Design a protein around this ligand. Structure first.
Ligand SMILES: CCC1(C)CCCCC1
Ligand SMILES: CCC1(C)CCCCC1
Ligand SMILES: OC1(O)C=CCC=C1
Ligand SMILES: OC1(O)C=CCC=C1
Ligand SMILES: [Zn+2]
Ligand SMILES: [Zn+2]
Ligand SMILES: [Zn+2]
Ligand SMILES: [Zn+2]
Lengths: 330, 330
């Protein structure tokens, strides 16, 4: 009946329109503290994030789930500052992404479970802010350590009811192996979102996940390098499929009976240090709406394609609330 | 005429007996903040470090160089606390070790130079504490990013006079490639210590470095897994050569005319999270003297083998002061 945010517990009704996969800043552990000038300044990053979240709020967004883990350089004090200034709830994450340092990579499944439970049940470092979601990652076949991370995420979710959300290399159908590992630990698919699923057009893969009960994260809708002439790094990151192609996967899954299992987001950021320099400028030129892209551009697009207002409100309000509200079976 | 420590500038005379390659805690960026229970508690780690440094001080140590970089999880506030409580000077490091995160690995040589200069000239994150040494690393042939790190370290040293110290895989003769890269940037070998050089018995490699003017870091004297029955992880980390074999390399280089180029240390730690769990307990059982091993065991051993007190005072007092005092040519 309560979801943990960076400003404390909120009721399910208070979450409202929720973007389920976003980042204030995509970075690395300790990086913002040690080199704030990379972002201009910490204050410039804060100001940019507050302006972006205020524009998202004006477009109807009420909550974002920041799926930055320890190794994305999640700074919950930064999230709290931006959340207060913008009047947008922010749910923080535990888990591990694709860049864990040695002190994480050498840990056992039991040790990792203790760490994820610390961040859900006690607090993130000394802040008392508790995570409301567990983020994990693979890029193709899981490494041995990533198998431990997936298992520890399942154990933390089974103890607390907090859901799991994943990064995939969708072209390698990673959700299949992720699901197998989660289910081997006894985790309900209703507690799991297989993310970056809009990176693929393979309906057999997407429906195989949805048929088992997984939530499907169509979370990078504005990610596209179409019309970026000869930018190899942006093309590799964003892909060559249009935002319309990605958005039509929302309609595709609705038409197959999976409206209650779709989660939609932008996978946007206000700073981004874990990729090439100036990538944030390139991304902002592609999508000047930032996190407001979903309500301002995707929702009207889907309405014109015949999707109802009621169905889209279910996807953007009802589904995130059911996903985020702690439970063992949703 | 001044060396930066975690408590401010000290004179060259104040450095005294100096251990040139040590760690308060071998960790990862942000790890101690996010999971202090891994070490029991932060307070337990502090107490262990203070007791260890007090025993080292009683044995004659006056300064240690903590060569923990950003990616070793260097916490300069922790170093300052331990330094004040133990009455032992601590020099902090900038640079990058073998575990840089994506936000570092994607940077250019110019960006890395700015970061190293920030930590030498301005301060480490918001503390105002300035680094007195630059630490870099290879493990075999340098990766493309490690080549950039080595070049940026050379540029930072050329601008400031602060020396460079290295991690090597000594069996692969890494010092040869490190030297070639440093010299391509114009760095004087007198500003560089090639570390972990006691990991090898190859006198042709060691004398080739010393003949060019490099300082030779015989920095892991107590590291040995001899007498550890069937501990594969400790054997892989510590090696099967005795501490006496390592210590005799000090005499070997003295006998070849290189007494002024030898730097000696323990490469000890009080916490260690970047390796297998409980490694600190294994290491403490091998060497209960910790950082006091050099003065309590190595110095008397070398005296019995015929090395003079004057020569050993030159190695432990004069050489570190010449190395650490900022200059372009020492
Ligand atoms: C029948 C699928 C549906 C028209 C339901 C109402 C929202 C839009 C999709
Ligand atoms: C001649 C080498 C030397 C005996 C000099 C004094 C210190 C010990 C070594
Ligand atoms: O994996 C990601 O969602 C994280 C940050 C950026 C881009 C992609
Ligand atoms: O490379 C090292 O010196 C760092 C920490 C530990 C062990 C070795
Ligand atoms: Zn991702
Ligand atoms: Zn993301
Ligand atoms: Zn090393
Ligand atoms: Zn070391």
């Amino acid at each position: 009946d309560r979801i943990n945010t960076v400003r404390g517990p909120i009721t399910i009704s208070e979450a409202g329109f929720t973007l389920t996969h976003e980042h204030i800043c995509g970075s690395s552990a300790g990086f913002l503290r040690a080199w704030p000038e990379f972002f201009g300044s910490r204050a410039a990053l804060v100001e940019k994030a507050v302006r972006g979240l205020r524009r998202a709020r004006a477009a109807g967004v009420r909550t974002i789930v920041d799926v930055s883990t320890f190794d994305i350089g999640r700074d919950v004090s930064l999230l709290a500052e931006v959340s207060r200034a913008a009047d947008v709830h922010i749910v923080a994450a535990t888990g591990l992404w694709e860049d864990p340092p040695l002190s994480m990579r050498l840990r056992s499944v039991e040790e990792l479970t203790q760490f994820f439970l610390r961040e859900i049940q006690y607090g993130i470092e000394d802040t008392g802010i508790r995570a409301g979601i567990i983020k994990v990652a693979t890029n193709g076949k899981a490494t041995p350590f990533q198998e431990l991370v997936l298992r520890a995420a399942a154990r933390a979710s089974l103890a607390t009811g907090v859901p799991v959300t994943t990064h995939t290399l969708a072209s390698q159908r990673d959700g299949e192996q992720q699901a197998a590992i989660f289910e081997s630990e006894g985790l309900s698919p209703s507690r799991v979102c297989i993310g970056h699923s809009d990176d693929t057009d393979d309906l057999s893969y997407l429906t195989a996940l949805a048929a088992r009960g997984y939530l499907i994260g169509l979370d990078g809708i504005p990610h596209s390098a179409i019309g970026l002439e000869d930018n190899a790094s942006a093309s590799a990151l964003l892909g060559n499929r249009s935002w319309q192609t990605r958005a039509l996967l929302i309609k595709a899954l609705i038409d197959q009976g999976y409206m209650k299992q779709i989660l939609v987001s932008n996978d946007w950021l206000f700073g981004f240090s874990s990729y090439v320099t100036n990538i944030m400028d390139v991304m902002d030129s592609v999508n000047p709406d930032g996190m407001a892209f979903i309500p301002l551009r995707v929702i009207p697009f889907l309405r014109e394609k015949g999707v109802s207002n009621e169905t889209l409100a279910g996807i953007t309000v009802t589904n995130p609330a059911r996903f985020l509200s702690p439970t063992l079976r949703a």
